[model samples]
Target: EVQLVESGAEVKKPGSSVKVSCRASGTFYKYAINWVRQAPGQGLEWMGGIIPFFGTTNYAQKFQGRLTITADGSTNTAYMQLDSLRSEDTAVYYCAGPSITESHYCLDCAAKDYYYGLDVWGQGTTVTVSSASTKGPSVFPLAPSGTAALGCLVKDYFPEPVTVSWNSGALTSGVHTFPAVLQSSGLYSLSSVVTVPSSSLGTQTYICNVNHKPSNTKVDKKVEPKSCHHHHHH
Candidate 1:
């Protein structure tokens, strides 16, 4: 069990760039530090953050409008910098974002396109505006035989946040095609795409996820092979 220890404090700032840090007291602090922002009754949105171990901080194009993150992995600390701060920036910065691995030790694979949900969050660190980017985060699959196009359907990403990476976390290269006729129930979405090439056969795990911040939904999917025995029987 990983614990995210956060303090709830309403910080009042005028123009100073405020900084905050998250520490992983227990668990190995080498993985990606997934930072998310929380809005009432909604899923936390992905905020720009640097990976503590790799120092690979990503600024979501949408978040480039407001937030930036910095970290010193040597200190085992992650720092978030909000510049020219304002009232909307007030909320919470968290150690409570998303990660690829869970307690059950499932590492999402990017080869196949099945999906699943994630664990609930740890208590987050709150940042009061006195400040904000309001948003959150998402994934798929193909093939059981020789070279197949494992095509994917991608849409509804404002700041466009879905990514296709290999089982090793390397961003994958493939032709992902989709058709989304948008219908908004607060957020617009369509489902189920399979367009990636399956170069080999046998059971493999592929991870896919979508993060809807305003809705607080972190939906990921784990894809694996079906037993031919089941298919034959059914």
Candidate 2:
């Protein structure tokens, strides 16, 4: 998993300049880093980003002169600098990788205009008076005859929303997603179950991938099936 972390002034002076760094880890630093901001009562605003490898930068129209985006390939990090910071600039900033869009521009199109989406986002790094922490789930295999129930226990995570995905060979039928419930610890727990028939249980592995935003990490757990002969032995 590629990780993006930001560090800068959470609160800044009215006329000073602040530089926020978006350091990336893993093989994804090679991809362009997209910077976005969210003000107190406003929606997300696209700030822009820099392509480190080629020394190219892109900026939003409104932020053209005041915002500067730069990248350092040597350190595998991206930086965004805002000049003449003001209370209006007091918003949380996030860094995410440029994503793909099949309709307008395909993967072959890497220019700034062609890029419109982002995937594998960095958890929002709060600035101007912002941030924190969270966890994902655990997976276990249940026993039976030709059938087995795989359970993914997602818990111990803060924040309202979480998503879970299951993968097992070519099978995905009979899967159930339980509602998330608030836990006593103020965290939330999500439960999901996947059923694998005896025929589909041979050598294929089962995986549970969980995404909890504030956690700033993606958790994946996989388990392989054991022999179902205990029933016949019974």
Candidate 3:
């Protein structure tokens, strides 16, 4: 059986580099090896491909300058390296090959028949572009006011994409989310605010949900206004 085994997961900081390998167990020269990637919570994206025998290479327009694909004939392994990494570059890399049916005995790599859809795929290698100082989010209630609001503050997280939402009984409005701001320490921070009606503020519970992608962790913080007394001077 044809099999492709990919490299293990990697944790690299921003501005660093990473190289992933894929070893082939069957006939390697019959078809081209292609690279695909999937970012956190994103769809699959094609990076590039290489024909080992002729050293023919094809790269996607988006990855033209940052990605390199190569192969080792003796070891039957394909390699992909990416440099000058950014937080958005964090993704799972997979090496794939064309299916047997789609591939033909190509006399030369220049034949258009050699380019086909990928059917055999590697298990995939996870690459996390983050800093060592990564930390989870914290939820805090805004000071009691005429309009009740809560804030979810996330700090020191790399690869800055996050999701923040509010969960209450049929309460979906008045939720505001801001873009992640890069800090001087090479990390990112962001905040989300959820405003509730003052009438039900004292009786209902507000839950703030934060989904952090790099660490694959979720934070849920609940706030109950009934537990605290709000002293108002009229």
Q: Please rank every candidate by TM-score, starting with the best.
A: 3, 2, 1
Q: Which residue pairs clash within candidate 2?
A: 10-128, 10-129
Q: Measured by TM-score, how close is model 3 to the native structure?
A: 0.55
**In candidate 1, which residue ranges exceed 4 Å CA deviation?**
40-43, 97-122, 131-234
Per-model tally of clashing residue pairs: 41, 2, 0
> CA shift at 206, candidate 1, in angstroms?
56
Stronger candidate by TM-score (1 vs 3): 3
Model 1: per-residue Cα lDDT at residue 114 = 15
C-alpha RMSD of each candidate structure in angstroms: 17.1, 10.6, 8.7
Report the error of model 2 at residue 171, Å. 38
* Global CA lDDT computed for model 3: 0.78
Q: What TM-score would each prediction reach against the true structure?
A: 0.41, 0.48, 0.55
Where does candidate 2 stray beyond 4 Å? 99-110, 113-116, 129-234
Per-residue CA lDDT of model 3 for 126-146, tens digit only, reads 788876755555555443355
Task: Give the lDDT of residue 156 in candidate 1.
Answer: 52
Maximum-TM-score candidate? 3
lDDT of 2 by residue, 49-150 (tens): 776656668899988889999878778777888887776887778888854423442334466654446875666655542122344444343332367777
Which window of 10 residues has the lowest lDDT sum in candidate 3?
Answer: 136-145
In terms of lDDT, the poorest run of 10 residues in model 2 is 129-138
What is each predicted model's overall lDDT from 0 to 1?
0.49, 0.67, 0.78
